[PDB]
Structures are given as C-alpha cells and as structure tokens.
C-alpha cells in the first residue's frame, strides 16, 4: 500500500463520521456510514489470508443490511412527512427499525455475534479503529433522536449486552475477543443511559476510548494476541505492568479509578428516573468483567509464568515503540477521578 492509497482510504475513514455528525440530512448520514464501511474493508483484508477475508465478508454483509434498513426508515419518514429528518410524529416502528439497525452497526446484543469473530480475524491497529472510531457516527445519529426513542427496547438491548459481554469475556482466552466483549458491555451502558442523558453516553464513550487505545498499543508492543503471550511481558517489557493493571481495573470500574465514574453517575441518573432494578442488575453483572480482568492482571503483573529462552535475545535487542500517547492516555484514564465534576 502506497502513500496515495493510504491517504485516500484514511481520509475517507475520517470523513465518514464527520459528515454523519455535521449533516442534518439523514441521506448524508447514511452516506457517511457507507464511506466508513467502504474504506474500512481494505484495511481489514490487507493481510490477504482466509481469516481476514472471512472477517471482511461478515462485516460487509452485516453493515450493508443495517444500512439498507436505516435507509428504509428514512424513506418511510419521507413518505410520511415530506421532510428528511425524524420529528415527534414518526411511526415508532420506523424508529425501532432504525434502532435495530444502529445496534447491529455498533455490535450490541443480540446483534453482536459478528464482532468477536471479525476482531479476531483482524489485526490490532484495525480493532482499535473498529472499536473506537467506528462507534461515533452511529451513536451520533442516536444522540440526535434521543427524545423520541423506546426505553423498553433500549434497556433490554443494554442489559442483554452487559450479560453477554460478561459471559463471553469469562471464557475467551484471546485479547481481541476480550476487547470485543468489553466494547459490547460499555456500549450497553451507553445505550442504557442514552434516552435520559446523552452527555453521559459521550462521557463513557471518551472514557472507554482513552482506556482502549492504550491497551491495544500495549498489546501491539509485542503483538501479544494471547494470555500466555502477554504473560511473558514481565521478561519482555516489565515497565508496562504498573499501567496495564491499573487500566484493566479502571475498565472493570473500580471505585478509585476514572472508569468508575461512568457507572456511578449513570446509576445516579437511572435512580433519579426510577430504573433502580436495571441499574442493580447491571452493577452486579459488571463484576464478571472485573473478574476476567483480574484474571489477566494476575497472569501479567502479580505472578510470573514460565518464560522462554530466546526472550534473552529479545532482551538483548532495544525498542522505540511506545510513543508519548501511551503514557498520556493511561495517566488521564487512571488518575482523573478528582476532576469528575468537570468531566460531568
């Protein structure tokens, strides 16, 4: 891949969500989504192996069906009201079809089965984008219509997502599938709080992004796509444990760490709205995410696993990978609770 191709594809990847967020016309939003899809597929398939091809095929089919359903919703609203924007008068079925489509675009349960497979078949720098930058346009389209949504189906989707994310991460031994299920869970939290306050959806979005980017960078440091491969980190690069552990605990949502605040304030709002039963279920089932993050903190930072020999030569060699953003984002994501009133 040459510079011109790289520039065009990445400019499209960047432009998609920007059009989606800067356009008032649902047609232009749909355009942005299509841009994102078109420009993401090639990067997934770069390696040209069976797994990457399969992941690309699955992604394409799912996202294309979703886009078609969204465009049907738009066309129906157009026949109904003459305008190209959802108002307070659209048949709720239109908006529920739209929500189903956006949920399949994001990766929410029970529309999630494609996300772990794709992320696994895909490399690291691509999972990073797929799980951080490709959540911003479909969430924006929802933030624009939060007053006219169905709390019932939203909460069902969110709680299903929490549950399935926990019960997947409990079993997966692969970094990328673990990240996929964590994404599912946090997006469930977002959807849950959406129709009551979207500022908190955006808060949790930025928190999850700041928490995910540096984790994928940590992994890419040694291309450790597995638990038994990341356990050798104590001999390969032990100056990263003090931060991997803290970022994983923050993801889990442990009180003294940034990652807590999202759950805390979202539960607060749900209580103000009398969604206490759902808030309780979610808060109790996030502890499994915390569990299978602690199980990794163990194998990485609190106990040394059987190492290898050529790791000696790996020690001999130097390295210049981890740019400043790693430290910056990890600190901002682990030590920023005293500033919660501002982030709110």
């Amino acid at each position: 891949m040459n510079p011109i191709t790289l520039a065009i594809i990445y400019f499209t990847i960047f432009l998609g969500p920007v059009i989606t967020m800067s356009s008032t016309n649902l047609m232009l939003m749909w355009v942005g989504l299509e841009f994102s899809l078109l420009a993401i597929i090639p990067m997934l398939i770069n390696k040209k192996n069976p797994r990457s091809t399969e992941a690309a095929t699955k992604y394409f089919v799912t996202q294309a069906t979703a886009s078609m359903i969204i465009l049907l919703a738009i066309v129906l609203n157009y026949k109904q009201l003459g305008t190209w924007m959802f108002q307070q008068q659209t048949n709720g079925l239109i908006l529920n079809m739209t929500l189903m489509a956006l949920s399949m675009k994001l990766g929410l349960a029970p529309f999630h089965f494609w996300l772990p497979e794709v992320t696994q078949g895909i490399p690291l720098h691509m999972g990073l984008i797929l799980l951080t930058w490709q959540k911003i346009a479909p969430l924006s389209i929802l933030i624009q219509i939060y007053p006219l949504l169905n709390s019932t189906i939203i909460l069902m989707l969110a709680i299903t997502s929490i549950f399935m994310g926990a019960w997947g991460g409990l079993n997966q031994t692969q970094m990328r599938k673990i990240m996929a299920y964590s994404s599912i869970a946090h997006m469930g939290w977002m959807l849950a709080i959406l129709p009551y306050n979207p500022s908190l959806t955006l808060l949790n979005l930025m928190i999850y992004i700041i928490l995910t980017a540096p984790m994928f960078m940590a992994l890419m440091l040694n291309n450790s796509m597995t638990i038994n491969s990341i356990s050798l980190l104590w001999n390969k690069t032990p100056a990263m444990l003090t931060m991997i552990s803290l970022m994983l605990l923050s993801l889990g949502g442990l009180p003294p760490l940034t990652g807590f605040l999202p759950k805390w304030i979202i539960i607060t709002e749900l209580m103000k709205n009398n969604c206490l039963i759902m808030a309780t279920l979610m808060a109790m089932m996030a502890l499994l995410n915390l569990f299978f993050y602690t199980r990794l903190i163990y194998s990485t930072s609190l106990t040394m696993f059987p190492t290898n020999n050529n790791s000696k030569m790996m020690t001999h060699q130097t390295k210049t990978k981890p740019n400043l953003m790693f430290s910056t984002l990890a600190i901002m994501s682990t030590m920023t609770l005293p500033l919660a009133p501002q982030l709110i």
Binding site: W30, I41, P50, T53, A56, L72
Partner: protein
C-alpha cells in the same frame, strides 16, 4: 400510491428475509441486497414525483451510486472467497470460532 407502496414494502421485506435466510450461496444474498436497493430507489422516486418536490431528485442518484460501490466491494470479496476455497459457499467460512 397506497397499494404500490404496500407492495414495494412487502418486496423489501421479502428481500431482507432472503438476506437473513442463507441458502448456501452468497450471490443469492448480494442479489437480495440489490433488490432492496431497487425497491428503495423506486419508493423514493415515486414519493418525489407524487409530491412534485424537484428538490429531492438527486437522492435516488446518490443512493444508486453508493449501492453500486457497495455491490462492487461485495463482489470483490466474493471473488477472493472463491479464489481461495473454490466455491461461494458459506459453510467454508467456519473459521474464527476459536
């Protein structure tokens, strides 16, 4: 108008049903997707012509362009799948389950 729109929506629903129900091929899914595209194109053009809103005619053109691009990339992916396995079958994409 009501009748033709009802039938167009039923047709879109049938093509979505076809997509969500695979029958061992992949072309037979891309074709259902294109049928959906066609139904939406027709509904949009028909609403434009019914309302006499000439400020909304570019919309079919745009969606046709983008559906064409989607179909092109889908056909390329199908071509790679065939080049590797030998068939546009869906039981051969059983990887990533581990």
């Amino acid at each position: 108008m009501p009748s033709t729109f009802f039938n167009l929506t039923m047709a879109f629903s049938l093509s979505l049903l076809g997509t969500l129900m695979f029958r061992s091929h992949l072309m037979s899914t891309l074709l259902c997707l294109e049928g959906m595209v066609l139904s939406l194109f027709i509904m949009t053009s028909v609403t434009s012509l019914n309302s006499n809103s000439m400020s909304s005619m570019p919309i079919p053109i745009t969606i046709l362009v983008f559906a064409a691009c989607e179909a092109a990339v889908g056909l390329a992916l199908l071509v790679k799948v065939s080049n590797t396995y030998g068939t546009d079958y869906v039981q051969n994409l059983n990887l990533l389950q581990c």
